[PDB]
Each structure stands twice: as structure tokens, then as C-alpha cells.
Amino acid sequence: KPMPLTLVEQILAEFQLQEEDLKKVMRRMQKEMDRGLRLETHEEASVKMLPTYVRSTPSEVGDFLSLDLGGTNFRVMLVKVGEQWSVKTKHQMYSIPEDAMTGTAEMLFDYISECISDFLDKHQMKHKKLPLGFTFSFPVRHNVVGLLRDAIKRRGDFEMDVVAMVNDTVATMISCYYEDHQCEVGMIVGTGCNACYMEEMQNVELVEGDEGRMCVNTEWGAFGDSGELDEFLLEYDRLVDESSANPGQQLYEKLIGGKYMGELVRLVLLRLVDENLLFHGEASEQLRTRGAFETRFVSQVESDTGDRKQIYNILSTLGLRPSTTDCDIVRRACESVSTRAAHMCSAGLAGVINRMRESRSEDVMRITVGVDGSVYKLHPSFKERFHASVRRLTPSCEITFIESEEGSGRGAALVSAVACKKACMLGQ
Ligand SMILES: O=C(Nc1nccs1)[C@H](CC1CCCCC1)n1c(=O)[nH]c2ccc(F)cc2c1=O
Ligand SMILES: OC[C@H]1O[C@H](O)[C@H](O)[C@@H](O)[C@@H]1O
């Protein structure tokens, strides 16, 4: 690596978070998680710690449908979960014709409903009112219940209960649990950022009972609206927040999520431009346009192999004619913002993991964390930086991170299993 420019590094060093900063953030998150779990303070808690009713001990529904929506295809699957759970399946991929996917959402779901009808006919299952759950297998890149319910109603020939979907973190946890039974945490680092985890029932005060565990959806994105992050906020963060749809809210998520990451980079570049450290102090009109620097541009800039080809092509699109030095600085700006996201994210997850270790009275905790989302998956080195930081903040914990594999769709079928069983348990 070359000796970097001192004045550039000074500006980028503002993104740095040391271990004591993260431990401070982690402890503040833990207090908000506590406040979310308590009956007395939950109502006023910013981090809601929502009971998911996904329990460690499951009631008996037999057959059900799982409907996996892809980009331009979908899968209908008939599932039977037997007791060690066996996931028995038969399925069918359907392609969506152009008219179906270019019409209204109703017309699209009329088609989906026709395919389900055809599938049920094929398997002679029209005699049952089956519950159906949705899962998503979109190609990763930086409502459906109602639509299907309405479309089934419109057909008026067979009945079927479309069950409420679980939160994406929960689906991630369940899907990953299928592969690894030590998975008791689900994390999403995508456009948004969130985590769920298996809390001790005694700590879930919103649900009576102290036996077993229940999944809690932190909705930790809302952390920060009482100033818990204020000392770590930079000018760029303040501007992002100020121009957002919800100023003052989702401050934690605003530091991590792919929704704002590109914008943060854009503002960093503009400051470097303003200080005559980048593009010889001339920014393009595209660079001075809000949202122009897409988050996908950040991961792409960081994917560059040293060739500067990726970066030069990104910046040329933005009407810039960058020198080699410009490209190198832009990469380091991207690094600085993305590493900070990984740091901030790690403090949250570390807070959860250390809480679990304490709650379970375990000297050494062994645990798997299931993770999904565009940032975590597509951003080069983000998950590695995230992993290393989480582990640094979690002594006495041995943490395995997994991403669920499509496989044969059984992890996804299990998500629908739980969703259907939950709906049943709650009396729909
Ligand atoms: O289905 C479950 N709970 C429900 N609550 C309400 C309705 S159904 C949980 C979920 C599981 C998720 C991952 C963490 C541990 C609990 N669950 C089990 O309890 N036991 C299991 C045993 C084998 C298996 F393959 C899956 C599960 C399972 O998902
Ligand atoms: O998609 C990841 C997360 O994004 C947002 O924070 C949503 O509020 C949350 O429910 C979701 O889990």
C-alpha cells in the first residue's frame, strides 16, 4: 500500500471507533433491550424487544403450503413436518408469464392462485383447508398476504388460510436453525438492520411463563432516539438524518443500513472535494445530487482488485474524471463508512450475545448466528470485519456465523412450518 495522504486520513479517521467506544455502545444497547423486555418500561422503550411467539417448545398442524417467491418465478410446496423434525415435501416451480407480471398485483395473484389450484388438484388436496406461508428467495441486491387472501376469495372454489409472515430476522434464524441446531440468533444487515434471538422466558415479561425460551425481535434499528449514539454521530450522519423521511428516528439503522450507506459516502466525498483533497475541488452535479452515490457503488468500489477499473467506472458514471489518487481516496472513504457500519452492528450483536451468555449462566457459550441481507452478503469484507469485531467484544463466546443455503427449500419450508404453527397457536 502507498503512504496515504495525511489530510485525507485525518477526515476519514473520524469514522474510527475504538473498542471502548463499542463497549459503550453495546452497554447502552443492552440497557435499551432490558427496557424493551420489561412490562413497566416496554411501552416507552424505543427498542421494542417484540415477543415473536416462536417458542423453544412447539401446536399440531399437519399439512401446509409453502410459497417461495423468487424474482420471476415462484415455488408452491406441500409440506408435512413429522417428529428431530423431518420436513417432507413435494413441490412445483411456476414461471410467471409477461402479462401476469406486467398487470396489476391482483392479476398477478390471480395467476399465483390459479397455479396453487392446479398444484392442489395435482396432489388431490382440495378437500383440506391448508394453511399457507410465504418465503422469499429474491436474488440478493442492494402486501403479499393480502394479495393472495383476496385472490383466493376471488376464486371462491377452494379455501386456504394465508398465515402472517414472520419478521425477516426470525425467518433467517429458523432457516439457519434447520442446518445448525445451535442457531438461536437471526440477523439482517440489508437496507435495514435488525436481529432476533432466543430469550429466556423469565426475561420476556410480556408473556407469562418462565420455562423455555422465546424468540424476541429486537427491532433494534430504533436505538438512538434518546441520544444513545449522539457522541458518535458525525456531520454526515446528521445531514442524512435531517433529510430522511423520519428525522430523529432509526438512528442506529442509519449508521449501518444499505439505505443510507451510499449517501454517507457521498457526503464524505463532498467534504473531501470541499477541502480540495478530491477531484481537485470540483464535484460533478451528479455527486451534488442526493442519493446519486448508490450503496451498491460502495460495495463495487471495495470489490476493485487494485486495478482501479471498478472505481474509475463508478465515478465516470457520476460525471467525474478521477485520477488514480482520486480513486484510491474514494475506496478508503467507502472502507471508512462500511467498517463503521460493521463496528456499530457488532456492538449490537455483541450486546445480544453477551446478554444470552449471562442469562443462561454459561461460563463459555457456544452459539450460531444466522445472517442475511445485501450488505452482509454482497459487501466485500464487511462480514469478515463484522465477525472479527463481534468476536472481539464477546469473550467466553464461540460464535459461528452461517448464511442459510437454499438447498432443496427445506429450511424455507421450516419457516412456513413455524409461521403456520404460530398462527394456529394464536387462534389465527
Ligand atoms: O417451531 C418452533 N416453535 C414454535 N413456536 C410456536 C409455534 S412453533 C421452534 C422454533 C425454533 C426456531 C429456532 C430456535 C429454536 C426454536 N422449534 C422447536 O421448538 N423445535 C424444533 C425441533 C426440530 C426442528 F427441526 C425445528 C424446531 C423448531 O423450529
Ligand atoms: O429488513 C431488516 C429490518 O429492517 C427494518 O429495521 C425493519 O423494521 C425490521 O423489521 C427488519 O427486520
Coordinates of C-alpha atoms and ligand atoms in Angstrom, one line a residue:
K1 CA 0.0 0.0 0.0
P2 CA 1.2 3.6 -0.7
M3 CA 1.7 6.1 2.1
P4 CA -1.7 7.7 2.3
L5 CA -2.4 11.5 2.2
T6 CA -2.3 12.9 5.8
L7 CA -5.1 15.4 5.3
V8 CA -7.4 12.7 3.8
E9 CA -6.7 10.3 6.6
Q10 CA -7.5 12.9 9.2
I11 CA -11.0 13.3 7.8
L12 CA -11.5 9.5 7.4
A13 CA -10.2 8.8 10.9
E14 CA -13.4 10.5 12.3
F15 CA -15.2 7.3 11.4
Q16 CA -13.0 5.3 13.7
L17 CA -14.5 3.5 16.7
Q18 CA -12.2 2.0 19.3
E19 CA -13.1 -0.9 21.5
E20 CA -14.1 1.2 24.4
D21 CA -16.5 3.2 22.1
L22 CA -18.1 -0.1 21.0
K23 CA -18.4 -1.4 24.6
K24 CA -20.0 1.9 25.5
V25 CA -22.5 1.5 22.6
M26 CA -23.0 -2.2 23.5
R27 CA -23.9 -1.4 27.1
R28 CA -26.3 1.3 26.0
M29 CA -28.0 -1.2 23.7
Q30 CA -28.2 -3.7 26.5
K31 CA -30.0 -1.2 28.7
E32 CA -32.5 -0.5 25.9
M33 CA -33.0 -4.2 25.4
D34 CA -33.7 -4.5 29.1
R35 CA -36.2 -1.6 28.9
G36 CA -37.9 -3.3 25.9
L37 CA -38.4 -6.6 27.7
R38 CA -39.8 -5.2 30.9
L39 CA -43.6 -4.8 31.4
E40 CA -43.1 -1.5 33.2
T41 CA -41.0 0.2 30.6
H42 CA -41.8 -1.6 27.3
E43 CA -44.4 0.9 26.3
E44 CA -41.9 3.8 26.4
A45 CA -39.0 1.6 25.2
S46 CA -37.5 2.6 21.8
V47 CA -36.1 -0.9 21.3
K48 CA -39.3 -2.9 21.5
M49 CA -38.0 -6.5 22.0
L50 CA -41.2 -7.8 20.5
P51 CA -42.3 -11.3 21.5
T52 CA -42.5 -13.4 18.3
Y53 CA -44.3 -16.3 20.0
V54 CA -41.8 -18.5 18.3
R55 CA -41.1 -20.8 21.3
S56 CA -38.3 -23.3 22.0
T57 CA -41.0 -25.9 22.6
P58 CA -43.8 -26.2 20.0
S59 CA -49.2 -26.6 18.0
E60 CA -50.1 -29.7 15.9
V61 CA -50.9 -28.6 12.3
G62 CA -50.3 -31.3 9.7
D63 CA -50.0 -30.5 6.0
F64 CA -49.3 -27.0 4.9
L65 CA -48.3 -25.0 1.8
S66 CA -45.1 -23.0 1.4
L67 CA -45.0 -20.4 -1.3
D68 CA -41.5 -19.2 -2.2
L69 CA -41.4 -16.1 -4.3
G70 CA -38.4 -15.6 -6.5
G71 CA -37.6 -12.8 -9.0
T72 CA -39.7 -14.0 -12.0
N73 CA -40.6 -17.5 -10.7
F74 CA -42.3 -19.0 -7.6
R75 CA -42.4 -22.3 -5.9
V76 CA -45.5 -24.0 -4.4
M77 CA -44.6 -26.6 -1.9
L78 CA -46.7 -29.1 0.1
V79 CA -45.1 -29.8 3.4
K80 CA -45.6 -32.2 6.2
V81 CA -43.4 -31.9 9.3
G82 CA -43.1 -35.0 11.5
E83 CA -41.4 -35.6 14.8
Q84 CA -35.8 -34.5 15.3
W85 CA -38.2 -32.9 12.8
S86 CA -38.5 -34.4 9.3
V87 CA -39.5 -32.0 6.6
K88 CA -41.4 -34.0 3.9
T89 CA -42.1 -32.1 0.7
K90 CA -43.4 -32.1 -2.8
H91 CA -43.2 -29.0 -5.0
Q92 CA -43.6 -27.3 -8.3
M93 CA -41.8 -24.3 -9.8
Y94 CA -44.0 -21.9 -11.9
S95 CA -42.9 -19.3 -14.3
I96 CA -44.9 -16.0 -14.3
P97 CA -45.9 -15.1 -17.9
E98 CA -45.3 -11.5 -19.0
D99 CA -49.0 -10.3 -18.8
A100 CA -49.3 -11.7 -15.2
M101 CA -46.1 -9.8 -14.1
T102 CA -46.9 -6.6 -16.1
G103 CA -50.5 -6.3 -15.0
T104 CA -51.9 -5.2 -11.6
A105 CA -50.9 -7.0 -8.4
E106 CA -54.4 -8.5 -8.3
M107 CA -53.9 -10.1 -11.8
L108 CA -50.5 -11.4 -10.7
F109 CA -52.0 -13.0 -7.6
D110 CA -55.0 -14.4 -9.6
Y111 CA -52.3 -16.2 -11.6
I112 CA -50.5 -17.4 -8.5
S113 CA -53.9 -18.6 -7.1
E114 CA -54.5 -20.5 -10.3
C115 CA -51.2 -22.2 -10.0
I116 CA -51.9 -23.2 -6.4
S117 CA -55.3 -24.5 -7.5
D118 CA -53.6 -26.6 -10.2
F119 CA -51.0 -27.8 -7.7
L120 CA -53.7 -28.8 -5.2
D121 CA -55.6 -30.6 -8.0
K122 CA -52.4 -32.4 -9.0
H123 CA -51.9 -33.6 -5.4
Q124 CA -55.6 -34.1 -4.7
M125 CA -55.6 -31.8 -1.7
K126 CA -58.6 -29.7 -2.4
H127 CA -60.5 -31.4 0.4
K128 CA -58.4 -29.6 3.0
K129 CA -58.2 -26.0 4.1
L130 CA -54.4 -25.8 4.2
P131 CA -52.5 -23.0 5.9
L132 CA -50.0 -21.3 3.5
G133 CA -46.9 -19.4 4.4
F134 CA -44.7 -17.1 2.3
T135 CA -41.0 -17.2 2.0
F136 CA -38.7 -15.1 -0.2
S137 CA -35.8 -16.2 -2.4
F138 CA -35.1 -12.9 -4.3
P139 CA -31.6 -12.6 -5.8
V140 CA -29.8 -10.6 -3.2
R141 CA -29.2 -7.0 -4.3
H142 CA -28.7 -3.6 -2.8
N143 CA -48.6 -6.7 0.7
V144 CA -48.4 -10.4 -0.5
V145 CA -50.5 -11.9 2.3
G146 CA -53.4 -9.6 1.5
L147 CA -53.0 -10.0 -2.3
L148 CA -53.1 -13.8 -2.0
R149 CA -56.0 -13.7 0.5
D150 CA -58.0 -11.5 -1.8
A151 CA -57.2 -13.6 -4.9
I152 CA -58.3 -16.8 -3.1
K153 CA -61.5 -15.1 -2.1
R154 CA -62.0 -14.1 -5.8
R155 CA -61.7 -17.7 -7.0
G156 CA -64.2 -18.9 -4.4
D157 CA -63.7 -22.6 -5.2
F158 CA -61.2 -23.8 -2.5
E159 CA -60.3 -22.4 0.9
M160 CA -56.9 -21.8 2.3
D161 CA -55.5 -19.7 5.3
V162 CA -52.7 -17.4 4.4
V163 CA -50.7 -17.1 7.6
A164 CA -48.9 -14.0 8.8
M165 CA -45.2 -13.9 7.8
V166 CA -42.6 -13.8 10.4
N167 CA -40.1 -11.0 10.5
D168 CA -37.1 -11.5 8.2
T169 CA -34.7 -11.9 11.2
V170 CA -36.8 -14.7 12.5
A171 CA -37.1 -16.4 9.1
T172 CA -33.3 -16.2 8.9
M173 CA -32.9 -17.8 12.4
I174 CA -35.3 -20.6 11.6
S175 CA -33.9 -21.2 8.2
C176 CA -30.4 -21.4 9.6
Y177 CA -31.5 -23.5 12.6
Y178 CA -32.7 -26.1 10.1
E179 CA -29.0 -26.5 9.1
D180 CA -27.5 -26.0 12.5
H181 CA -29.5 -26.6 15.7
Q182 CA -27.2 -24.2 17.7
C183 CA -28.6 -21.2 15.8
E184 CA -30.6 -19.1 18.2
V185 CA -29.9 -15.7 16.7
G186 CA -31.1 -14.2 13.4
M187 CA -29.5 -11.0 11.9
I188 CA -30.3 -8.9 8.9
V189 CA -27.8 -6.4 7.6
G190 CA -29.5 -5.2 4.4
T191 CA -31.3 -1.9 3.5
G192 CA -32.3 -2.1 7.2
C193 CA -30.6 -3.8 10.1
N194 CA -32.2 -5.9 12.8
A195 CA -31.7 -9.0 15.0
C196 CA -33.8 -11.6 16.8
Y197 CA -32.7 -14.1 19.4
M198 CA -34.0 -16.8 21.8
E199 CA -34.5 -15.0 25.1
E200 CA -35.2 -16.8 28.4
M201 CA -39.0 -16.8 29.0
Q202 CA -38.5 -15.4 32.5
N203 CA -36.9 -12.3 30.8
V204 CA -39.8 -12.0 28.3
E205 CA -42.1 -10.3 30.8
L206 CA -44.7 -9.5 28.1
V207 CA -45.5 -13.3 28.0
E208 CA -46.3 -15.1 31.2
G209 CA -44.2 -18.2 32.0
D210 CA -40.6 -18.7 32.9
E211 CA -39.9 -22.1 31.2
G212 CA -38.0 -22.4 27.9
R213 CA -37.2 -19.6 25.5
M214 CA -39.0 -17.4 23.0
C215 CA -37.7 -15.6 20.1
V216 CA -37.5 -11.8 20.6
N217 CA -37.5 -9.4 17.7
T218 CA -35.3 -6.5 18.9
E219 CA -36.3 -4.1 16.2
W220 CA -33.0 -2.5 17.4
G221 CA -32.9 -0.1 14.4
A222 CA -34.8 2.4 16.6
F223 CA -32.0 2.6 19.1
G224 CA -30.6 6.1 19.4
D225 CA -33.7 8.3 19.6
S226 CA -32.8 9.3 23.2
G227 CA -29.2 10.3 22.3
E228 CA -27.6 6.9 23.0
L229 CA -25.5 7.4 19.8
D230 CA -25.2 11.2 19.8
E231 CA -21.5 11.4 20.7
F232 CA -20.6 9.1 17.8
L233 CA -22.6 10.9 15.2
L234 CA -20.7 12.8 12.5
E235 CA -21.8 15.7 10.4
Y236 CA -22.6 13.3 7.6
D237 CA -24.9 11.3 9.9
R238 CA -26.7 14.4 11.0
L239 CA -27.3 15.5 7.4
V240 CA -28.5 12.1 6.4
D241 CA -30.9 12.0 9.3
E242 CA -32.1 15.6 8.7
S243 CA -33.0 14.8 5.0
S244 CA -34.6 11.4 5.8
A245 CA -38.3 10.6 6.0
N246 CA -38.0 10.2 9.8
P247 CA -35.5 12.6 11.3
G248 CA -34.6 11.6 14.9
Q249 CA -35.6 8.0 14.4
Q250 CA -33.9 4.8 13.4
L251 CA -30.5 6.5 14.2
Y252 CA -28.8 3.1 14.8
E253 CA -30.1 1.7 11.5
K254 CA -29.0 5.0 9.8
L255 CA -25.3 4.2 10.8
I256 CA -25.5 0.6 9.4
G257 CA -28.1 0.1 6.7
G258 CA -27.6 0.0 3.0
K259 CA -30.4 2.5 2.7
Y260 CA -28.1 5.3 3.8
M261 CA -24.6 3.9 3.3
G262 CA -24.1 5.3 -0.2
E263 CA -25.4 8.7 0.9
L264 CA -23.0 8.8 3.8
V265 CA -20.1 8.1 1.3
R266 CA -21.4 10.8 -1.0
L267 CA -21.2 13.4 1.8
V268 CA -17.7 12.3 2.8
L269 CA -16.6 12.7 -0.8
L270 CA -18.2 16.2 -0.9
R271 CA -16.3 17.2 2.2
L272 CA -13.1 15.9 0.7
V273 CA -13.9 17.9 -2.5
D274 CA -14.7 21.0 -0.4
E275 CA -11.3 20.7 1.3
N276 CA -9.6 20.4 -2.1
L277 CA -8.5 16.8 -1.4
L278 CA -10.5 15.1 -4.1
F279 CA -11.3 15.8 -7.8
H280 CA -9.2 19.0 -7.5
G281 CA -12.1 20.5 -5.6
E282 CA -14.6 20.2 -8.4
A283 CA -17.6 17.9 -7.8
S284 CA -20.0 16.9 -10.6
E285 CA -23.7 17.8 -10.5
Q286 CA -24.4 14.1 -10.1
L287 CA -22.2 14.0 -7.0
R288 CA -24.0 17.0 -5.5
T289 CA -27.3 15.2 -6.1
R290 CA -28.9 13.4 -3.1
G291 CA -28.9 9.6 -3.5
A292 CA -26.6 9.7 -6.6
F293 CA -23.9 7.6 -4.9
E294 CA -25.8 4.3 -4.5
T295 CA -24.9 1.8 -1.8
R296 CA -24.2 -0.8 -4.5
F297 CA -21.4 1.7 -5.7
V298 CA -19.8 1.3 -2.2
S299 CA -19.5 -2.5 -2.4
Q300 CA -18.4 -2.3 -6.0
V301 CA -15.7 0.3 -5.2
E302 CA -14.5 -2.0 -2.4
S303 CA -14.5 -5.0 -4.8
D304 CA -11.9 -3.4 -7.0
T305 CA -8.8 -5.6 -7.4
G306 CA -6.3 -2.7 -7.2
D307 CA -6.8 -2.1 -10.9
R308 CA -9.0 1.0 -10.1
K309 CA -11.2 -0.1 -13.1
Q310 CA -14.3 -0.7 -11.0
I311 CA -13.8 2.6 -9.1
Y312 CA -13.0 4.6 -12.3
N313 CA -16.1 3.3 -13.9
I314 CA -18.3 4.1 -10.9
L315 CA -17.0 7.7 -10.8
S316 CA -17.1 8.2 -14.6
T317 CA -20.9 7.4 -14.4
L318 CA -21.1 10.2 -11.9
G319 CA -19.6 12.6 -14.5
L320 CA -16.2 12.6 -12.7
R321 CA -12.8 12.3 -14.4
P322 CA -10.9 10.8 -11.4
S323 CA -7.1 10.5 -11.2
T324 CA -5.6 7.3 -9.7
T325 CA -5.3 9.2 -6.4
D326 CA -9.0 10.2 -6.5
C327 CA -9.9 6.5 -7.0
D328 CA -7.7 5.4 -4.1
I329 CA -9.2 8.1 -1.8
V330 CA -12.8 7.1 -2.8
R331 CA -12.1 3.5 -1.9
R332 CA -10.8 4.5 1.5
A333 CA -13.9 6.7 2.0
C334 CA -16.0 3.6 1.2
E335 CA -13.9 1.5 3.6
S336 CA -14.3 4.0 6.4
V337 CA -18.1 4.2 6.1
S338 CA -18.6 0.4 5.7
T339 CA -16.2 -0.5 8.5
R340 CA -18.0 1.9 10.8
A341 CA -21.3 0.1 9.9
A342 CA -19.7 -3.2 10.8
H343 CA -18.4 -1.8 14.0
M344 CA -21.7 -0.4 15.1
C345 CA -23.5 -3.5 14.0
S346 CA -21.1 -5.7 16.0
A347 CA -21.7 -3.7 19.2
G348 CA -25.4 -4.5 18.9
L349 CA -24.9 -8.2 18.2
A350 CA -22.3 -8.4 20.9
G351 CA -24.8 -6.9 23.3
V352 CA -27.3 -9.6 22.4
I353 CA -24.7 -12.4 22.6
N354 CA -23.3 -11.3 25.9
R355 CA -26.8 -10.9 27.3
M356 CA -27.6 -14.5 26.3
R357 CA -24.3 -15.8 27.8
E358 CA -25.2 -14.1 31.1
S359 CA -28.9 -15.1 31.0
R360 CA -28.0 -18.8 30.5
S361 CA -25.4 -18.8 33.3
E362 CA -22.9 -20.3 30.9
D363 CA -19.2 -19.8 31.5
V364 CA -18.4 -20.5 27.8
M365 CA -21.3 -20.0 25.4
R366 CA -21.3 -21.9 22.1
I367 CA -23.8 -20.3 19.6
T368 CA -24.6 -20.0 15.9
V369 CA -25.9 -16.7 14.4
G370 CA -27.8 -16.9 11.1
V371 CA -27.3 -13.8 8.9
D372 CA -28.8 -12.5 5.7
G373 CA -29.1 -9.1 3.9
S374 CA -27.4 -7.4 0.9
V375 CA -24.7 -5.6 3.0
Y376 CA -23.6 -8.7 4.9
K377 CA -23.6 -10.9 1.8
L378 CA -22.5 -8.7 -1.1
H379 CA -20.3 -6.1 0.5
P380 CA -16.7 -7.3 0.2
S381 CA -15.0 -7.9 3.6
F382 CA -18.0 -6.5 5.5
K383 CA -18.9 -9.8 7.2
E384 CA -15.2 -10.5 7.9
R385 CA -14.8 -7.1 9.6
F386 CA -18.1 -7.6 11.4
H387 CA -17.2 -11.1 12.5
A388 CA -13.8 -10.0 13.9
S389 CA -15.4 -7.1 15.8
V390 CA -18.2 -9.2 17.3
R391 CA -15.8 -11.8 18.5
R392 CA -13.5 -9.2 20.0
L393 CA -16.5 -7.9 22.0
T394 CA -17.6 -11.4 23.1
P395 CA -15.0 -13.2 25.3
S396 CA -16.1 -16.6 26.5
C397 CA -18.3 -17.0 23.4
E398 CA -17.6 -19.2 20.5
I399 CA -19.7 -17.8 17.7
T400 CA -20.4 -19.4 14.4
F401 CA -21.9 -17.3 11.6
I402 CA -23.9 -19.1 8.9
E403 CA -25.9 -18.0 5.9
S404 CA -28.8 -20.3 5.0
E405 CA -28.4 -22.4 1.9
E406 CA -31.4 -22.7 -0.5
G407 CA -30.6 -26.5 -0.6
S408 CA -33.9 -28.2 -1.5
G409 CA -36.0 -25.5 0.1
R410 CA -36.5 -27.3 3.4
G411 CA -35.0 -24.5 5.6
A412 CA -37.6 -22.2 3.9
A413 CA -40.3 -24.8 4.4
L414 CA -39.5 -24.9 8.1
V415 CA -40.0 -21.1 8.3
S416 CA -43.5 -21.7 6.9
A417 CA -44.0 -24.5 9.4
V418 CA -43.3 -22.3 12.3
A419 CA -45.4 -19.4 10.8
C420 CA -48.3 -21.8 10.4
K421 CA -47.9 -23.4 13.8
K422 CA -47.7 -19.9 15.4
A423 CA -50.8 -18.8 13.7
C424 CA -52.6 -21.9 14.9
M425 CA -51.3 -21.4 18.4
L426 CA -52.6 -17.8 18.5
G427 CA -56.1 -18.9 17.2
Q428 CA -55.2 -17.3 13.8
Ligands
LIG1 O1 -41.4 -24.3 15.9 C1 -40.9 -23.8 17.0 N1 -41.7 -23.1 17.9 C2 -42.9 -22.8 17.7 N2 -43.5 -21.9 18.4 C3 -44.7 -21.6 18.1 C4 -45.2 -22.4 17.1 S1 -44.0 -23.4 16.5 C5 -39.5 -23.9 17.3 C6 -38.7 -22.9 16.5 C7 -37.2 -22.9 16.7 C8 -36.6 -21.7 16.0 C9 -35.1 -21.7 16.1 C10 -34.6 -21.6 17.5 C11 -35.2 -22.7 18.4 C12 -36.7 -22.8 18.2 N3 -38.9 -25.3 17.0 C13 -38.9 -26.2 18.1 O2 -39.3 -25.8 19.2 N4 -38.3 -27.4 17.9 C14 -37.9 -27.9 16.8 C15 -37.3 -29.2 16.6 C16 -36.8 -29.6 15.4 C17 -36.9 -28.7 14.3 F1 -36.4 -29.1 13.1 C18 -37.4 -27.4 14.4 C19 -37.9 -27.0 15.6 C20 -38.4 -25.6 15.7 O3 -38.5 -24.8 14.8
LIG2 O1 -35.0 -5.9 7.0 C1 -34.3 -5.8 8.2 C2 -35.1 -5.0 9.2 O2 -35.4 -3.7 8.6 C3 -36.2 -2.8 9.4 O3 -35.5 -2.4 10.6 C4 -37.5 -3.4 9.9 O4 -38.1 -2.5 10.8 C5 -37.2 -4.7 10.5 O5 -38.4 -5.3 10.8 C6 -36.4 -5.7 9.6 O6 -36.1 -6.9 10.3

